[PDB]
Design a protein around this ligand. Structure first.
Ligand SMILES: Cc1ncc(COP(=O)(O)O)c(C=O)c1O
Ligand SMILES: Cc1ncc(COP(=O)(O)O)c(C=O)c1O
Ligand SMILES: N[C@@H](CCC(=O)O)C(=O)O
Ligand SMILES: N[C@@H](CCC(=O)O)C(=O)O
Ligand SMILES: N[C@@H](CCC(=O)O)C(=O)O
Ligand SMILES: N[C@@H](CCC(=O)O)C(=O)O
Lengths: 446, 446
């Protein structure tokens, strides 16, 4: 082939590619290769993927087991239509029900990504219950297509709402303990009592008989790893039981080992009626998402036609990578390694709280972590208040990117979501870089 | 693990897989392998893929050029994030702009499939024009997610409408010449004049200044290869020009050689402001879709933030498969071969009209074709009128499947959309199976 130079790759991109969530034509980094927890630009500089790209490359890059499964499947059958059974699609559905809970869940509806599966979970909840309304969090992101974007809490919904908001999407405010003035640990029962009651009250004023589902990120991800107050998720599950509302957990970012469990909702003593997934089901190697449905929902669509579908549902190549990814998580006890890696990451960030005036809070479950950056520790003034213009936080990400610490954040947060295969030696080598950049912020942005 | 038997693969699917557009748990055919224009169940029976699966496997199955590109990309880098340029993504955007028209189009917005590309095309049209409303045809399908399904005409939208129609989606009736009582040879100028005036009048009664886009399949596909009357598509383009409305053509099904041209809208004297694609950009081998946008639209999003995005946009593996597919279409002059195969398929289907009491009309452009099945040639009584319960058409589809002639249809139609690589000899072997089955319909369903 006519292999392109680094400059041509970034040149053509700036000129011909439509970039997500940006204005067109900026400068762009051209990436040549990735492997393990690293990737390289065409100048040869190495970046350590401390955010797993978009918290999706859970097993690092170029994992032989997934790469090999893909190539093997490509030699058999890259795609076969949804109307037919295939080995990878059959095996992955069983594996997913099994790791989720084979006594509660029954079927998996395969999709292309995250927005795709939230869209279909919404449609399925309205069909099963006969009710029109969907409750979702203001502090949440569920996708960019009109249905998932209407359910999404953060301001990316504003553009989708051009022409009008979609009917039946009611938003309720969920607690962000630090930003709301409280202190995790001490105040959990107070915040949980307050926000569970706010939600109960809003349900009553919307008519609980008309609310088909409550949809929640298992742990709010892109918007800052907002660990909920203890007991909050169980109370939501309790409200759903009281009112006949289905509970839908969004596992797109927090699933597949991110938190130390296969699914983040497994940290809570709740069985959601449905939950949605994508990123780590294949570590991003082939697009795949899905909906895991309870036995009750499975039964409903045995009697009624499931009015859902998409050309690539259960894509064969994609599922083959899924089988390899899931088998890797299990055979290599990746959750246990993630729980143990928590022991290096969590104490480190907590000490960044004590050591840095610009770091107000640290949250960490497994390798799912974030820092709240503040302009003023004493007043809790955020370094970038909600939906601020000219947030300085990209500036901070660029200082990090300069040391080979690649990550991202939204609002006033820095995420730290390294690949689940990262080692203690590797963490202890990268985290000093985060401390160095935090010091720069201390001295330049307060 | 241990390879699964056919009976194990079909059992696990029936028990654990969520099937699109069906009640759960039925019987299912397990497919073991695919190659060229065929695929095989686990007993070894061969099916000739006369519908290209979902009119997507444009270059057949396991085509070495795409298979190999996939493996080569998997050995380098399966995925790299949207914020980075990658060789396959830059090369595919330029190649796509180039085959579409480099003097008119500028950028490509990559998605995972067809539905999200229509979702995003809608979002962009509302952002670019500042207007809320989308016009689309009642006889159309654009996807199943809330946005694309509200834009879709056929009854699969009704489920999405649980909870309410999303605002700003106005539907207009497009002509199906045969089903409306006219004749494609002698009647186009009247039908075109009438339906353009109906659309103009409806645009006027909705406020043309409030219509951001008219969205239409270049040639209505899954709903029956409904070739438009002469001059209709050009007149739609004229109304858009008159009123400042963007024209969005959906090439998801009719793109990539299906009709004898690279894009079906290229059979008409129109350049759409945007057009959407999925299936044949990769022949389904890896999920990929997109929006090709004009220079004007690209300019808008140079000055304004493109508030669209998805985790897997510009997926690296998927794009590598795309580069190989598009290069094949061009290097092997697949369009020219499709035109010459049109010269076999069109006369055969036309001769099925003359030969069978049950065949009212034949439509065919390139290898994009369908038969209208009737209970009564004289009264034009359809064999399955719109949205009938207990359609007998699956019976016909099954009689065909029994001869190894695998296809599908919607409403009262049988599609014939074989892979673009099918040869004259192969056509001469398969088409007799369609003739045999039509005789059975003649004698058993009128
Ligand atoms: C928690 C969560 N849900 C849903 C999504 C949307 O997923 P996708 O990009 O695959 O449409 C994302 C991606 O940011 C996410 O982080
Ligand atoms: C013309 C057209 N547009 C859009 C779609 C939806 O595409 P997808 O199933 O990839 O989401 C289809 C699928 O049949 C289609 O035929
Ligand atoms: N995370 C963004 C991509 C980021 C970027 O394009 O700068 C997405 O949803 O695609
Ligand atoms: N047409 C369906 C095919 C699956 C089926 O018929 O079961 C789809 O969009 O996935
Ligand atoms: N029966 C066609 C299409 C099946 C489907 O609609 O999923 C085939 O697979 O060849
Ligand atoms: N923030 C991620 C991804 C941005 C994108 O999706 O392009 C990174 O910097 O690696």
């Amino acid at each position: 082939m006519e292999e392109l130079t680094g400059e041509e790759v970034a040149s053509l991109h700036s000129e011909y590619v439509m970039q997500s969530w940006h204005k067109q034509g900026g400068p762009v980094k051209p990436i040549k290769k990735a492997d393990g927890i690293y990737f390289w630009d065409y100048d040869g500089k190495r970046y350590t993927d401390m955010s797993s790209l978009l918290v999706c490359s859970n097993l690092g890059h170029e994992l032989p087991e997934i790469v090999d499964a893909i190539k093997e499947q490509a030699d058999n059958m890259c795609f076969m239509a949804p109307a037919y059974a295939s080995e990878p699609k059959s095996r992955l559905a069983k594996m997913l029900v099994d790791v989720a809970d084979p006594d509660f869940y029954q079927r998996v509806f395969f999709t292309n990504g995250g927005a795709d599966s939230n869209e279909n979970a919404i449609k399925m909840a309205r069909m099963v219950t006969g009710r029109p309304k969907i409750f979702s969090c203001y502090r949440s992101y569920h996708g960019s297509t009109i249905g998932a974007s209407n359910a999404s809490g953060d301001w990316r919904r504003f553009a989708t709402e051009l022409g009008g908001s979609a009917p039946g999407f009611v938003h309720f405010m969920n607690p962000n303990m630090y930003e709301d003035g409280y202190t995790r640990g001490v105040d959990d029962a107070t915040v949980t009592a307050d926000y569970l009651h706010r939600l109960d009250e809003q349900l009553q004023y919307e008519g609980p008989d008309s609310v088909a589902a409550i949809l929640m990120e298992s742990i709010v991800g892109a918007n800052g790893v907002i660990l909920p107050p203890e007991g909050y998720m169980e109370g939501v599950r309790a409200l759903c039981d009281k009112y006949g509302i289905l509970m839908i957990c969004d596992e797109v970012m927090a699933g597949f080992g991110r938190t130390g469990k296969m699914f983040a909702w497994q940290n809570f003593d709740v069985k959601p009626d449905m939950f949605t997934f994508a990123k780590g089901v294949t570590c991003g190697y082939v697009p795949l998402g899905g909906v895991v449905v309870s036995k009750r929902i499975s039964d409903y669509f045995t009697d009624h036609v499931l009015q859902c579908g998409l050309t690539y549902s259960g894509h064969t190549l994609a599922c083959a990578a899924g089988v390899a990814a899931v088998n890797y998580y299990l055979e290599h006890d990746v959750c246990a390694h993630v729980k143990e890696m928590e022991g290096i990451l969590k104490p480190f960030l907590e000490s960044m709280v004590e050591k840095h005036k610009c770091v107000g809070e640290a949250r960490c479950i497994g390798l799912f972590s974030a820092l709240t950056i503040v302009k003023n520790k004493e007043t809790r003034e955020l370094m970038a208040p909600y939906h601020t213009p000219n947030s300085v936080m990209p500036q901070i990400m660029a200082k990090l990117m300069d040391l080979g610490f690649s990550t991202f954040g939204r609002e006033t947060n820095i995420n730290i979501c390294p690949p689940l295969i990262i080692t203690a030696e590797q963490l202890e080598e990268e985290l000093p870089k985060l401390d160095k950049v935090l010091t720069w912020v201390d001295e330049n942005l307060c």
